[PDB]
Antibody
Framework: QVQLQQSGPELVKPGTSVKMPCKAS????????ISWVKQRTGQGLEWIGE????????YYNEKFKGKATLTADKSSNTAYMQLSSVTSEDSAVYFC?????????????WGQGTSVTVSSAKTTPPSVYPLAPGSAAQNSMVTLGCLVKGYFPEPVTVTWNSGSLSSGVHTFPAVLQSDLYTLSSSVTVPSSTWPSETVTCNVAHPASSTKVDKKIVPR | DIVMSQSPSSLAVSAGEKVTMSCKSS????????????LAWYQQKPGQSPKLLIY???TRESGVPDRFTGSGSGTDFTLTISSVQAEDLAVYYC????????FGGGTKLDIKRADAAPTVSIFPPSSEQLTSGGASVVCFLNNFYPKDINVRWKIDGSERQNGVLNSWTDQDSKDSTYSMSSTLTLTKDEYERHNSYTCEATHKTSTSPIVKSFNRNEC
């Protein structure tokens, strides 16, 4: 199982640095090149550069030379990207990629991406509020939700019954208002499931290391 | 620096229909010795990290449906989806690795389908949010097509525009629909004053708005 494991989300102050790890398991880490790729919010992908971990020789996109610095630790099969003197322009998701250089020349494995937000705004944890349905005539499926309000930065992840409830879920992209994000999620389940059973929504905010579970009770 | 170019930038077709998409490079990506074009095609579905589809211009990677096919050579390249599925919603990027790495700007595939009126649900404030002084009324307008939809909030019959926050999901990969959350946020005092709260959805599928409401003082 070729897997590339990237750190959870980063808030970093303007003018300072972030150093981000990509931990490689399932193959001979030194037989493959690691490529790093940037993706600004709702934009295309942009290749940052590549490191040959066996030698440590690096190549980049010339836009990022002197902004991004790539290293590797052969002992711990872990590649790293440092970004120095960062600006709002550096805010993005960053991936690492296994790069089958010398044969396919393609990035066959991608880590899950690291969200980097550049701001001197404070880390704030979310308030998670249950959305239990009111008085209405709307009667075979019931829809419930969670309001995740007043957190910085992105992201939060939301799961229902810790991931058991996957179909019929809609999590809506957060919206920034005055240094603070708000997001919402909905789950749609049979009328035979709730409230006879438990539907709990799980909010992770890794920036502030928050995990909250909000049980959806009626009324 | 090899520049890469995709057209069209957006693209919308029905399930089961064919779609082709174009990728041009500023130089030839063909290596005369190996006989291979270093041009790859990737798929990035919404929320997910990219996935390698094809390498050497025409060689389909593992874990990729046979409906995907790559072709071309030199400086002109094509991706054919021979029978598009709902799951194929995504941006498709071509990328050269002939020298360094360059990604195209992306070709967004939107899926077109039979219209659907939205399932609307309205949720009063959580008792927990009202304890803190705040009052958010949330409306989920789920599983609709096409994406254009207006929402309006009435308070005791009068429209309200300040304090609303709206958020659209990307198209669903299973049924090709869209969804939206709309949240009307108020103080508890302001919420406590009035009695009727009403969420109206205007969509192509009816000329009559879909209306959902609740009375604060009721069950």
């Amino acid at each position: 199982q070729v897997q590339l494991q990237q750190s959870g989300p980063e808030l970093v102050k303007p003018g300072t640095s972030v150093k981000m790890p990509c931990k490689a398991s399932g193959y001979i880490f030194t037989d493959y090149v690691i490529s790093w790729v940037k993706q600004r919010t709702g934009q295309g992908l942009e290749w940052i550069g590549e490191i040959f971990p066996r030698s440590g020789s690096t190549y980049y996109n010339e836009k990022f030379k002197g902004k991004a610095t790539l290293t590797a630790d052969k002992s711990s099969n872990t590649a790293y990207m440092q970004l120095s003197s960062v600006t709002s322009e550096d805010s993005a998701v960053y991936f690492c990629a296994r790069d089958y250089y010398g044969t396919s020349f393609a990035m066959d494995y991608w880590g899950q991406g690291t969200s980097v937000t550049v701001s001197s705004a404070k880390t704030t944890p979310p308030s998670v509020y249950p959305l239990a349905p009111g008085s209405a005539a709307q009667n075979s499926m019931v829809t419930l939700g969670c309001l995740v309000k007043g957190y910085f930065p992105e992201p939060v992840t939301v799961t229902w019954n810790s991931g058991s409830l996957s179909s019929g879920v809609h999590t809506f992209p957060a919206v920034l208002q005055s240094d603070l994000y708000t997001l919402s999620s909905s789950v749609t389940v049979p009328s035979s499931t709730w409230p006879s059973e438990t539907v709990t929504c799980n909010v992770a905010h890794p920036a502030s290391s928050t995990k909250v579970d909000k049980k959806i009770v009626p009324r | 620096d090899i520049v890469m170019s995709q057209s069209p930038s957006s693209l919308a077709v029905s399930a089961g229909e064919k779609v082709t998409m174009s990728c041009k490079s500023s130089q030839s990506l063909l290596n005369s010795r190996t006989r291979k074009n270093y041009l790859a095609w990737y798929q990035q579905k919404p929320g997910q990290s990219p996935k390698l589809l094809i390498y050497w211009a025409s060689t389909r990677e593992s874990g990729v449906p046979d409906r995907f096919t790559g072709s071309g050579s030199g400086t002109d390249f094509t991706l054919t989806i021979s029978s598009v599925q709902a799951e194929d919603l995504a941006v498709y990027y071509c990328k050269q690795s002939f020298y360094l790495r360059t990604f195209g700007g992306g070709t967004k595939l939107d899926i077109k389908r039979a219209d659907a009126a939205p399932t609307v649900s309205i949720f009063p404030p959580s008792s927990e949010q009202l304890t803190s002084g705040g009052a958010s009324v949330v409306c989920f307008l789920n599983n609709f097509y096409p994406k254009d939809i207006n929402v309006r909030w009435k308070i005791d019959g009068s429209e309200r525009q300040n304090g609303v926050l709206n958020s659209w999901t990307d198209q669903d990969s299973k049924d090709s629909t869209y969804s939206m959350s709309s949240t009307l946020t108020l103080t508890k005092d302001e919420y406590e004053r009035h009695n009727s709260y009403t969420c109206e959805a205007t969509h192509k599928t009816s000329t009559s708005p879909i209306v959902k409401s609740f009375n604060r003082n009721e069950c």
